[PDB]
Paper text:
Itaconate, which is an unsaturated dicarboxylic acid produced by the decarboxylation of cis-aconitate, is an intermediate metabolite in the tricarboxylic acid cycle and is a striking example of a small metabolite that regulates enzyme activity for cell growth and survival. Initial studies of itaconate production in fungi indicate that the decarboxylation of cis-aconitate to generate itaconate was catalyzed by a ~ 55 kDa protein, which was called cis-aconitate decarboxylase (CAD). In mammals, high amounts of itaconate are produced by macrophages activated by lipopolysaccharide, which is a major pathogen-associated molecular pattern in gram-negative bacteria. Our structural investigation of IRG1 from B. subtilis (bsIRG1) shows that bsIRG1 exhibits the typical fold of the MmgE/PrpD family containing two distinct domains, a helical domain and a lid domain.
The 1.78 Å crystal structure of full-length bsIRG1 was elucidated by using the molecular replacement (MR) method. There were two molecules in the asymmetric unit, chains A and B, both constructed from residues 3 to 445. The structure of bsIRG1 revealed that it consisted of two distinct domains, a helical domain and a lid domain. As the calculated molecular weight of the monomeric full-length bsIRG1 (residues 1 to 445), including the C-terminal His-tag, was 47.7 kDa, the peak generated by the dimer indicated that the working stoichiometry of bsIRG1 is that of a dimer in solution. Unexpectedly, unknown electron density was detected on the side opposite to the active site, between the helical domain and the lid domain, and was assigned to 3-cyclohexyl-1-propylsulfonic acid (CXS) by a ligand identification tool. The main forces involved in CXS binding to bsIRG1 were hydrogen bonds formed between the sulfonic acid moiety of CXS and Y269, R283, and L339 of bsIRG1, and hydrophobic interactions formed between the cyclohexyl group of CXS and the hydrophobic pocket formed by F93, L408, and L419 of bsIRG1. Based on the structural comparison of bsIRG1 with IDS epimerase, mIRG1, and hIRG1, we noticed that bsIRG1 was an open form, whose two loops (A1 and A2) were localized to expose the active site. Structural comparison showed that A1 and A2 loops are flexible and control substrate accessibility by working as a gate. An in silico docking simulation of cis-aconitate and bsIRG1 indicated that C1 and C6 carboxylate groups of cis-aconitate form an extensive network of hydrogen bonds with D91, H102, K200, K266, and C271 from bsIRG1, while C5 carboxylate forms hydrogen bonds only with H151 from bsIRG1. In hIRG1, Y318 performed the role of Y146 of bsIRG1 by interacting with the C6 carboxylate of the substrate.
Residue numbers in the entry:
A (entry chain B), B (entry chain A): 4 to 448
The structure:
């Protein structure tokens, strides 16, 4: 009669992710996307606030701060590197997680790898994603609806499990590490729209790393924190659901492959990517523009735009969650790029165009079987001068599983910030599973 | 201020605790009890596990680790000193908090006072207790019953508010710090019976200190984390209750005075202190002993022993939550002292005596008007040869508000560990509000 805590600890401990060629390939691509997203945010001012904070605390310079040209202590690095990866909303997402797995897991593993077992990082990454996906599937819808932020609340446990795999924790050590992570698990969706939201990823990475370090120190703790009427799932979610779903069909195929990580080509809310692809198609094929369009209708399935909470953004940052701003920015001839999603105010011409973009809801159109997320689509319809219309539909955006990034796409995202030579050195280190060389290259200056 | 977050921030910011002579006296006594509890646990092996961890991380030696003879970084010191204060269950309790306020608040304030504003520490301590008491009152009974550990889940916000008062944060900065603390709030009762339970106090102190440092760094965050249907009280407790109770009659009377901190004379669960007082009375006045007692009946009102979850402890640590062990230990002629509540096994003779002690429940006996906690009493009845019985009743144990420690009790608790001359110098520094000298003394080199 094995409880959920022991069940998860055993599944993690005895995993053999390196036996899956596809999962290893996907983990290498994940390291490259994580690096690209972190580099693209290297000038974000929140990073400097956090660097001044940890410099005031002090710490041994052991782990690189990605893209920042310095090192810091392991737990400090986990906080910093999680924030950096998530700061621009340019990092990866996972449909099971309903959140951002690599921004939590990879910082924890970077801190572990800088200090041993780096030969297990890729496998640990696969296992970490496996846990976070399954936690997201198991916790229940009410968890997010009530106000918890999955990236934070499930990230600490997933990071503890990834690092626990990497460091070859015993069954008892891993059970305790899971409980040490669960008893720190936190993060509130009220922080959305502020830089505390990406900081949740760093604090979750830090909490999971601390959980492993406590277990390795022989610190005492519960071995059954998932179990019972006061266990983690009863407290934060749906324990019946977790009992049915958490461990079923563990591993191959790994969740990092199926349903798979989605690597973003746009630095804004994944829920706007369909519209972004569609309007770009219309601008390319039909030469539409803000000047020649009277107005726009954006068609979602009911609830498809729930994450796009900004209908009248004033800032590029607020515009990250506005399908109106995404479409209007493209119609005005601008790239859907990092520089246009900052705290600077949206110019008045684009705001005028935003006022001519409306959302409508279509409960009859059947989503495509390969849609990401499942059941999602978006149609963009432009109204031109003489009553003419044109439309484009996207169900699986570029970068999502089923519409994967090309070789060249990965290189392009990496070279947003660094020369071609740097990006190629990074790619080669990752291809060779040379984690020491990877870590050396991603520090930058 | 309008809304709960702004309201609490304003209540904290504009507090004038220094106008309350009684509150200042109580805060000084709380500092001395915190110090004595921390000193008494200085040999705890968990402390060395945590010291090795933070030494591996590194940090500037800025803040004393109480009783350990070294300094560490502010956030590290908060973690260490909260653990140290709570490690033996010898630290203070508060009925509104349903938890251990000083083990959270004083570590955060020590880290803040070591870097300035030390003249505000005593006031900040009062304000911190005010917040944690009100959170414990406002969150609702279901919070603890569901499985959350109030010391952990309410401590970060209380510590952020104490340090925010000490460092004179603005209204906006305090609103943000409250949210930075709330979005980290965590801690599960499944960790009871392990040293992770006292570590919750340090992790809460650390999270509250981080919240203040983020607000001071101009880090972005929600200013309304208590408010709305995804706010802290809706997520973790009873938002209706909090709307009625959180801010009402603030600071009048200060909760550190009424109902007041309880300073323990025994290093075990407060709920056993009545029985401890009673059995000692019986041993003193009637010369009962393990040898001449057939059996014991211990009488509680319904629910009075709910916290005493161990009826058949195997170790002194488990014995901390066993009225049977407390009574049996006293009957066998041993002091109710730190050395008898360690992880070492309970000897077979004491276990035999434990088997002769039964709990019974009396719903008719009226608690005394001065009972602490409200409605609580304990009667100890000893059955001797020839059918004789003797009984002793305790309603307000020594150390509880209304039956406060003498000066001599305070010095005795301090000298469990250090010579009388050292303790007198510590007390003198606290009496004069010489916080710098106090901080110098409690490092123990």
């Amino acid at each position: 009669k094995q409880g959920l805590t022991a069940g998860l600890a055993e599944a993690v401990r005895t995993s053999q992710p390196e036996h899956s060629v596809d999962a290893i390939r996907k983990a290498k691509k994940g390291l490259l996307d994580f690096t690209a997203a972190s580099f693209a945010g290297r000038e974000d001012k929140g990073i400097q606030k956090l660097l001044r904070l940890i410099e005031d605390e002090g710490g041994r310079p052991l782990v690189p701060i990605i893209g920042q040209g310095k090192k810091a202590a392991p737990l400090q690095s986990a906080m910093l590197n999680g924030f950096i990866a998530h700061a621009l909303d340019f990092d990866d997402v996972h449909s099971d997680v309903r959140g951002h797995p690599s921004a939590v897991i990879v910082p924890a593993l970077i801190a572990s790898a800088a200090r041993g077992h780096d030969e297990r990082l890729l496998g640990a990454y696969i296992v970490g994603v496996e846990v976070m996906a399954r936690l997201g599937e198991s916790i229940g819808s009410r968890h997010y609806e009530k106000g918890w932020h999955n990236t934070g609340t499930l990230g600490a446990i997933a990071a503890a499990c990834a690092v626990g795999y990497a460091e070859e924790l015993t069954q008892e050590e891993l059970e305790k590490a899971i409980g040490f992570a669960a008893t720190q698990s936190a993060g509130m969706r009220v922080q959305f729209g502020t830089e505390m939201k990406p900081l949740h990823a760093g604090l979750a990475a830090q909490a999971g790393l601390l959980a492993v370090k406590l277990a390795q120190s022989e610190f005492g703790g519960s071995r059954t924190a998932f179990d019972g009427e006061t266990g983690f799932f009863s407290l934060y979610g749906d324990v019946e659901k977790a009992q049915h779903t958490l461990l079923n069909d563990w591993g191959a195929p790994w969740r990092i492959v199926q349903p798979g990580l989605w690597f973003k080509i746009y630095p804004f809310c994944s829920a706007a990517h369909h519209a972004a692809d569609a309007v770009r198609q219309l601008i390319s094929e039909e030469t539409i523009s803000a000047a020649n369009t009277e107005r726009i209708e954006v068609i979602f399935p009911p609830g498809g735009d729930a994450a796009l909470t900004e209908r009248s953004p004033k800032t590029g940052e607020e515009g990250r969650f506005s399908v109106e701003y995404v479409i209007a920015l493209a119609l005005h001839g601008h790239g859907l790029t990092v520089e246009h999603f900052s705290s600077q105010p949206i110019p008045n011409g684009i705001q005028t165009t935003i006022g001519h973009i409306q959302r409508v809801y279509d409960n009859a159109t059947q989503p495509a079987p390969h849609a990401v997320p499942k059941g999602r689509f978006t149609i963009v319809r432009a109204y031109l001068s003489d009553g003419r219309i044109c439309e484009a539909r996207v169900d699986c955006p570029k970068g999502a599983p089923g519409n994967e990034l090309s070789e060249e796409d990965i290189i392009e995202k990496l070279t947003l910030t660094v020369p071609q030579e740097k990006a190629r050195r990074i790619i080669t280190a990752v291809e060779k599973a040379d984690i020491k060389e990877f870590l050396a290259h991603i520090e930058l200056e």
